[PDB]
């Protein structure tokens, strides 16, 4: 059969490197998470109403009256969190092992990352809690042709029902575009095949995928499901905010406004830059700096398995990414601010300046440069 | 970057320049008209 | 024949003539069309 | 595509059937040594950034507290 | 922020598989019905919710029929009140929040349905707040309609201290000490904010047993199908 | 200096996998061309060295230290071939530039 | 008739408690002495409360 | 010829005879 | 060894044993699991 043959060529029997570690599981996990989100999202959509009078009431009706509706809702929320965990580890694998030299795959990836962040933002706006509304107003004004654009998105003077309903429509429709972009992501990769942790040409040692990296993906799916169900069934609110369980009050502002934890690194950067515009731009660059990453590779070795100085710089980058995630949480006061300012300066200087200079030095040490 | 921008290449730069400007012009007219940019349309 | 050699032979110019014409066409079309509709009703 | 992937010659690759070999040969016998071998080749590259993250985090917390702590000299 | 983070308490549901004490939920529902229902609302908890939980269908039935509920204007445009049904939700204290503002000196008593979930460290907070109306220290002065509750944000909660020892009598007879009452209402409010707490933990126990069965078996299947390669011995034999 | 270079060589760890520096070089067209120019012996040997590394990686294991290639042992076999390819490319590029 | 107060009573006996309480006393007089100071003692008391309450709870529900 | 070289022993990996195969 | 030759060697029978076992496993698992949960709480 042509299709089955096509599948066989792509999934059942696709030459793959024999030595790829567990990190290469993560992208498949992302696909599973996408399907899980879509499935749970569909079962949230049969009872959710995108009306500002009834959105919180519909969410409470899902949690209290629909049979196992609390299960599907908290699976959806913690599956969004699991999606961002697997996304960050997938991007970290791509940065560490030199997989960004697959440039088309990397660019389709950063497009997918932007789409996933927009989908999660509008989805967090959707339950219409206190925290959802205040966060929503903030980001829209972030866009402020600025004023017009903000008002357009809001669909009015300020976020109100007009927004909620169009955010429901956009949050519904974008994961299917994410699925199509993921199909393009898989295509742009099979043309080149996956990379291996040594960074070398693995053409001499390739094995099938059906019996070797399928049972491995099944085991990774089982472990990810274990972590997701222990996040849902035991600590269902360790990652969310309590203030989202209050209804949206436009008159009452919260004492401290946050997005959800995976936006924090960006939040820190935005807060760090004094200028509003500067913050927005830096914020964008924060994500975009990655796209820029394949043009900064100045080494003759693809992976970081044999590159210790750039390994040290990479782990310092992971370290101050964790620092920026912490700072975002901290309120505006000394000395959280300075750390934020430095951490952002160090983040951009390590990605932009320090890694290509270190790669040049590493090439000089091996008598290559 | 002389590999693709050598002395010979400059020649090509000027050779193509006119065409490039034309294309920007087309886009410019379009933007003005399509988005009804009125600052330019009003003139 | 001059037009072809001037604005319709070079694709860039072809686009230019199209865009510019379209920019004005709307003015003319809307105006003319409206006249007709008004006359009708 | 399997086949016509690359040129490999004069190599002999031996293997055994899954059911013919022990499932976890010396799993903890050498696994532990190896895991430990591994950790000592990567710990100096990995750990000290997270150590100074822990110090900066604690420092920030304590510093923040001191910052909040009322200035005794003030208001007197 | 500027408040004592409520000290954690050894709750009977604090453990990883530890369910709620349902007698405490029944006592806390009695505490809410006799004390807390005068100002606070429970819009997402119908009387039916009680059924099967610390109360039966008939038990709740009598509880639901103790109150009256306007059942609309019928067919004669006649707004009319009827005894509550197992399908009726808990009655409103006020018809609209502006009446709550007028009756509570400008303060709005919030929905207590999800209070525990909505308040950071709610169960503790609740207990602390209800049991934390300590005297304002020197240097701080509060206006009328305010009370120095260290835990409450700002330490100025409009709510006056509602639990005086022996405020209400527990039908079970368990001594109605202020604390015994605050612990019961914190358990109940908790239940309110998560009626499925018990059912879930059962699922989680079944999930842990199933994953403890299935993870080593799937690991064994993977290590079977990967042993072949993990034993592969390569040898280079240039013809030389 | 070279002492540290040897330390860095050890740091690279390809010796742990018995990988010649040339083996490590990430494949590039120029590299590929040089590889093509390589004599069969080198090519075949290079192949096995590379294959060996992957297998070791698959098992997350390293060669016996003694089997490990010494800083001195490592040879830049492909270096010259590459030099030629590069120079030729440079020549053609300059020709194009002019 | 409050086990909690009794718990607090035992808590009162705790030395750490008295130390914090002492500080509070200093400031109360401190505030009084400073006729027009916005120097409050929430700072001090909070501290006292934390310890007192933290210990209270440690032995509060168990007693409950 | 190729005869010179011999198969390495996988006994280390090898586990515990059609009698056993059925069980295995 | 008999089992393999009887219910685990023919794939059809392999499926049969799986399905039948699963049919009963639920009974046992639920029962056993519930016992544990109850004992815990
Ligand atoms: C330590 C004590 C035991 C010991 O010495 O074990 C040696 C053993 C390593 O032995 P080795 O011979 O040196 O390495 C070969 C591997 O065993 C070859 O196996 P492997 O490690 O390549 O297996 C693939 C990988 C597959 O892992 C994944 O797919 C992980 C997927 C990502 C994580 C989940 C996603 C969410 C992450 C959120 C953060 O699985 C693991 O890494 C461990 C799976 C354990 C399953 C549960 C066992 C009970 O250690 C482990 O396997 C570590 C985990 C078990 C302990
Ligand atoms: C986590 C720590 C894992 C660990 O053990 O680190 C050491 C390991 C070394 O890997 P390697 O040198 O390739 O050796 C593989 C086989 N010897 O290192 C690795 O496991 C390689 C790390 C690959 C991916 C790491 C992801 C880190 C988190 C990234 C999040 C943010 C990144 C960008 C986000 C924007
Ligand atoms: C000089 C090295 C001496 C080593 C002595 C140890 C014994 C060596 C011989 C025995 C073998 C033991 C095991 C060997 C394992 C692998 C080899 C190894 O660890 O090598 C040392 C390693 C690599 O050395 P190399 O990269 O050449 O050093 C450049 C330093 N930048 O280098 C390191 O591991 C050093 C790493 C230091 C990292 C310091 C980072 C400080 C700054 C962190 C900032 C984080 C963010 C802060 C906040 C920012 C925002 C405010
Ligand atoms: C039964 C013993 C209870 C419990 C467990 C709680 N209350 Fe009340 N409450 C009342 C008013 C007017 C307010 C708002 C005051 C203000 O906002 O200034 C409250 C508030 C609360 C909260 C929320 C605290 C917060 O941080 O928002 C909580 C958790 C709470 N109460 C618990 C009024 C009353 C009553 C009328 C006098 C009585 C009776 C109760 N409350 C009873 C209880
Ligand atoms: C097309 C598939 C999807 C549909 C139909 C969908 C639908 C919904 C609906 C109706 C809600 C509101 C119910 C609730 O409060 O949980 C929601 C919430 C949410 N969704 Fe989705 N969703 C989909 C995919 C995704 C994906 C892929 C993500 C991750 C990027 C995501 C992230 C979220 C988040 C974070 C929330 C907020 C959960 C919370 O209340 O805490 N959704 N979604
Ligand atoms: C929407 C979420 C994503 C999905 C579903 C996804 C899916 C996949 C899949 C299935 C693979 C092949 C298996 C693997 O190697 O892990 C893969 C590989 C890859 N992806 Fe993604 N991906 C996502 C996000 C991204 C992002 C954001 C990037 C860019 C940073 C990216 C870049 C790559 C690269 C470079 C590879 C090649 C791996 C290698 O050979 O080393 N992906 N992705
Ligand atoms: C080279 O080996 C492969 C591979 O050939 C394929 C098709 C996929 C794609 C398989 C999936 C299951 C995609 C993820 C799941 C979705 C639902 C999308 C891989 O993840 C992969 O591993 C690195």
TrEMBL record, chain F:
Gene3D superfamilies on file: Cytochrome b-c1 complex subunit 7 (1.10.1090.10)
Assembly description: Component of the ubiquinol-cytochrome c oxidoreductase (cytochrome b-c1 complex, complex III, CIII), a multisubunit enzyme composed of 11 subunits. The complex is composed of 3 respiratory subunits cytochrome b, cytochrome c1 and Rieske protein UQCRFS1, 2 core protein subunits UQCRC1/QCR1 and UQCRC2/QCR2, and 6 low-molecular weight protein subunits UQCRH/QCR6, UQCRB/QCR7, UQCRQ/QCR8, UQCR10/QCR9, UQCR11/QCR10 and subunit 9, the cleavage product of Rieske protein UQCRFS1.
Organism: Mus musculus
Topology in the lipid bilayer: Peripheral membrane protein
Keyword presence, Protease: no
Main subcellular localisation: mitochondrion
Entries under InterPro entries matching the protein: QCR7, QCR7_sf
Protein family according to the UniProt entry: Belongs to the UQCRB/QCR7 family.
Function of the protein: Component of the ubiquinol-cytochrome c oxidoreductase, a multisubunit transmembrane complex that is part of the mitochondrial electron transport chain which drives oxidative phosphorylation.
Pfam families registered for this protein in UniProt: UCR_14kD
GO molecular function: protein-containing complex binding
Keyword Translocase attributed: no
Keywords: Electron transport, Membrane, Mitochondrion, Mitochondrion inner membrane, Respiratory chain, Transport
Name of encoding gene: Uqcrb
Any single Gene Ontology cellular-component annotation: respiratory chain complex III
Phylogenetic placement of the source organism: Eukaryota, Metazoa, Chordata, Craniata, Vertebrata
GO biological process: mitochondrial electron transport, ubiquinol to cytochrome c
Identification of the protein by name: Cytochrome b-c1 complex subunit 7
Subcellular location: Mitochondrion inner membrane
